[PDB]
Amino acid sequence: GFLELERSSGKLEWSAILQKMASDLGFSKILFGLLPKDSQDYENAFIVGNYPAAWREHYDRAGYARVDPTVSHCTQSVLPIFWEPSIYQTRKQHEFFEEASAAGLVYGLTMPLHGARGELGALSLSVEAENRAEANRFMESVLPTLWMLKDYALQSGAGLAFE
Amino acid sequence: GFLELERSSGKLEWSAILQKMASDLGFSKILFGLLPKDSQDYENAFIVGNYPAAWREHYDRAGYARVDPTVSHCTQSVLPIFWEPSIYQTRKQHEFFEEASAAGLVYGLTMPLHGARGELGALSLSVEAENRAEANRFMESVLPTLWMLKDYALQSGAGLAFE
Ligand SMILES: O=C(Oc1c(Br)cc(Br)cc1CNC(=O)c1ccccc1[N+](=O)[O-])c1ccc(Br)cc1
Ligand SMILES: O=C(Oc1c(Br)cc(Br)cc1CNC(=O)c1ccccc1[N+](=O)[O-])c1ccc(Br)cc1
């Protein structure tokens, strides 16, 4: 089932299959980001998903890559970071949280990606939920499936992005 | 469950916890092996588990690291490789399979590990079964839990090994 991603014929079908897998699990918004080994910026970044255009533009223009707490987490860990109040420590980090929320992205998680050739990225997914308790229950129900998905997405996406 | 790995202090206790987690999922023999970023040999490796000593020594003395098809796989992929007839092709590769079988390690899988700081290794697990079909059913039944475990073991184990 997960293998349909590597079996996908091209970037278009991969991105579509990834978004549909996420959708079927219950996540209506996803962003897969991957950088080649030892990148100094995002010039060669492979970024694919269905996050709103306005938010993508705003995140870039505001330089939120340097504020977003899930980014530094990804450089230090292979474990998921859940979007919880505790992760936003500084005012800048709270402002990022509010801007994301205003854009419709409030509940979710970020799965770090570390590929066999030094690729560095994240798979982020947001769930449209009523409240945090509801978000938590949903995410726990699907977490083991998502844990497998992120590595399949990484292996397949790396081959598609940089070869 | 998974928190006990972090909670533990000492290589002996950590290894015993991992071994017990693996056993509970149906695997009686495991090996956790981890190398620092860009290692050029095995001198600085952290290798821990309950593989029999005679097999550990033979593998080393025979140079099976350069033959073992799971080793080259780990350098190329984040996805598991099942211990399968098809991964063996050369004469030395058939010899490796035969000797692993003689040591009682016939069915299993190797989960590649790629750490956030360039750590490289594998969690390899063997399952006792009447035949390969049965072994495959045992492994598939716990694959999502194993997928989480290998990442928890990597994050925790890298700290224990190198920090
Ligand atoms: O994908 C990455 O950052 C992205 C980019 Br680029 C654009 C946007 Br918009 C969002 C992210 C990742 N962050 C999130 O998805 C996120 C995390 C927590 C809360 C809210 C959000 N969010 O953007 O809605 C990224 C960058 C560097 C590294 Br290393 C890993 C991942
Ligand atoms: O752990 C690694 O190799 C080991 C070492 Br060292 C000693 C021994 Br004994 C075994 C391995 C890994 N291979 C296996 O466990 C294996 C794989 C397939 C079939 C049978 C076995 N086996 O050893 O029984 C390893 C080395 C390099 C990299 Br990269 C990743 C993993």
From Swiss-Prot, chains A, B:
Transcriptional activator of elastase structural gene (LasB). Binds to the PAI autoinducer. Signal peptide: none annotated. Keywords: Activator, DNA-binding, Quorum sensing, Transcription, Transcription regulation. The keyword Mitochondrion does not apply. GO terms for cellular component: protein-DNA complex. GO terms for biological process: positive regulation of DNA-templated transcription; quorum sensing; regulation of DNA-templated transcription; regulation of elastin catabolic process; regulation of gene expression. It comes from the Bacteria. LasR in strain PA103 is not active, this is probably due to the change in position 180 of the sequence. One of its GO terms (molecular function) is sequence-specific DNA binding. Belongs to the autoinducer-regulated transcriptional regulatory protein family. This is Transcriptional activator protein LasR. It comes from Pseudomonas aeruginosa (strain ATCC 15692 / DSM 22644 / CIP 104116 / JCM 14847 / LMG 12228 / 1C / PRS 101 / PAO1).
